[PDB]
């Protein structure tokens, strides 16, 4: 338990964030390799 | 002593079935030490670097995000990360920046899990800057 | 039935590898090379020696090309590809079968390079 | 039937295989690049996968 716990996230919340941070101190070399993971591609279709 | 150390980011792979002695993870819920006959355990990992020994004389300074530590009945681990870098990518310029920044953000969150995800974020860049 | 069996299965059979490097020549532009057995890396090299071999320096431009003017006779020409079908030439390199007459001089070749 | 009727079915056979030579060796390309990203992709696969066998 932490504070992520008990306020209603998950560890993919979690995990997004602090993976998020390491391609924001890269370099300028190495920042193609971050975007190029970089996985927001598929969208979202819920019928309602 | 009759090792397997496996080591995989989704795009490249460090090791495959070679174990050198020694494995130095930073775990969730605290760390430990692989004495390569340890009482396995099913771990999940925190912000923080991860120091393989080599036999080979020197160590290997990795430095992975949020993975999963898997040693298990037989002397064999499975250490897969996300986001594995070494030291040389990463900028120690920029790390220090991104810290003070988050902290002002803290106190202007009126929410309460807006804020929990703004204390999330000082700790990795927390761990960033020890490090180096 | 007419020219004999010794000229037919001779030229029969470089007809038949000059086939098969041109169906292997298409996985090779495509999908790669490595991929494909031992055996038929045999078969690559020696259909670039046969279709090599075939040329011949001609006397009617020997003012141009420099090169001297050969005419073969039949029976160089069915001993020499009697023998590239069978490995016997094989471990020559190929430019030592660009524009030569028989297959005598084509030995006399490898030596001049390096 | 008539002159004018084969000639112009005759052309329209001619760009579809014109189109599906080059939809040929455009997704044989895009195959070559995911049969090397599938290696590394597969023992971090495998590995993940390991812990529910050994139990």
Same mark, same amino acid.
């Given at each position: 338990? *932490?504070?992520?716990?008990?306020?209603?996230?998950?560890?993919?919340?979690? +995990?997004?964030?602090?993976? #998020?941070? $390491?391609?924001? *101190?890269?370099?300028?070399?190495?920042?193609?390799?971050?975007?190029?993971? +970089?996985?927001?591609?598929? #969208?979202? $279709?819920?019928?309602? | 002593?009759?090792?397997?150390?496996?080591?995989?980011?989704?795009?490249?792979?460090?090791?495959?079935?070679?174990?050198?002695?020694?494995?130095?993870?930073?775990?969730?819920?605290?760390?430990?030490?692989?004495?390569?006959?340890?009482?396995?355990?099913?771990?999940?990992?925190?912000?923080?670097?991860?120091?393989?020994?080599?036999?080979?004389?020197?160590?290997?300074?990795?430095?992975?995000?949020?993975?999963?530590?898997?040693?298990?009945?037989?002397?064999?681990?499975?250490?897969?990360?996300?986001?594995?870098?070494?030291?040389?990518?990463?900028?120690?310029?920029?790390?220090?920046?991104?810290?003070?920044?988050?902290?002002?953000?803290?106190?202007?969150?009126?929410?309460?899990?807006?804020?929990?995800?703004?204390?999330?974020?000082?700790?990795?860049?927390?761990?960033?800057?020890?490090?180096? | 039935?007419?020219?004999?069996?010794?000229?037919?299965?001779?030229?029969?059979?470089?007809?038949?590898?000059?086939?098969?490097?041109?169906?292997?020549?298409?996985?090779?532009?495509?999908?790669?090379?490595?991929?494909?057995?031992?055996?038929?890396?045999?078969?690559?090299?020696?259909?670039?020696?046969?279709?090599?071999?075939?040329?011949?320096?001609?006397?009617?431009?020997?003012?141009?090309?420099?090169?001297?003017?050969?005419?073969?006779?039949?029976?160089?020409?069915?001993?020499?590809?009697?023998?590239?079908?069978?490995?016997?030439?094989?471990?020559?390199?190929?430019?030592?079968?660009?524009?030569?007459?028989?297959?005598?001089?084509?030995?006399?070749?490898?030596?001049?390079?390096? | 039937?008539?002159?004018?009727?084969?000639?112009?079915?005759?052309?329209?056979?001619?760009?579809?295989?014109?189109?599906?030579?080059?939809?040929?060796?455009?997704?044989?390309?895009?195959?070559?690049?995911?049969?090397?990203?599938?290696?590394?992709?597969?023992?971090?696969?495998?590995?993940?996968?390991?812990?529910?066998?050994?139990?």
């Amino acid at each position: 338990v *932490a504070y992520w716990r008990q306020a209603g996230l998950s560890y993919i919340r979690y +995990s997004q964030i602090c993976a #998020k941070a $390491v391609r924001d *101190a890269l370099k300028a070399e190495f920042k193609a390799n971050a975007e190029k993971t +970089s996985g927001s591609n598929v #969208k979202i $279709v819920k019928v309602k | 002593g009759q090792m397997s150390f496996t080591f995989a980011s989704p795009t490249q792979v460090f090791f495959n079935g070679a174990n050198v002695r020694q494995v130095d993870v930073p775990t969730q819920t605290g760390a430990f030490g692989i004495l390569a006959s340890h009482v396995p355990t099913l771990q999940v990992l925190r912000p923080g670097l991860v120091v393989v020994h080599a036999e080979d004389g020197t160590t290997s300074k990795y430095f992975v995000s949020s993975g999963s530590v898997t040693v298990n009945a037989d002397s064999s681990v499975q250490l897969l990360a996300e986001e594995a870098v070494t030291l040389d990518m990463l900028d120690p310029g920029v790390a220090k920046a991104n810290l003070e920044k988050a902290q002002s953000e803290l106190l202007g969150a009126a929410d309460e899990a807006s804020r929990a995800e703004i204390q999330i974020r000082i700790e990795a860049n927390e761990a960033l800057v020890k490090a180096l | 039935n007419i020219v004999g069996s010794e000229h037919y299965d001779v030229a029969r059979g470089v007809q038949k590898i000059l086939q098969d490097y041109k169906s292997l020549q298409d996985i090779i532009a495509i999908l790669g090379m490595d991929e494909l057995s031992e055996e038929d890396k045999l078969t690559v090299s020696r259909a670039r020696k046969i279709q090599r071999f075939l040329s011949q320096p001609f006397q009617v431009a020997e003012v141009f090309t420099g090169h001297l003017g050969k005419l073969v006779p039949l029976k160089e020409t069915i001993k020499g590809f009697q023998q590239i079908l069978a490995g016997e030439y094989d471990h020559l390199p190929e430019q030592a079968f660009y524009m030569v007459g028989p297959i005598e001089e084509a030995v006399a070749k490898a030596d001049k390079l390096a | 039937a008539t002159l004018k009727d084969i000639t112009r079915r005759l052309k329209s056979i001619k760009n579809i295989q014109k189109i599906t030579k080059s939809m040929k060796m455009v997704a044989a390309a895009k195959y070559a690049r995911a049969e090397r990203d599938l290696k590394p992709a597969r023992v971090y696969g495998i590995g993940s996968l390991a812990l529910y066998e050994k139990a």
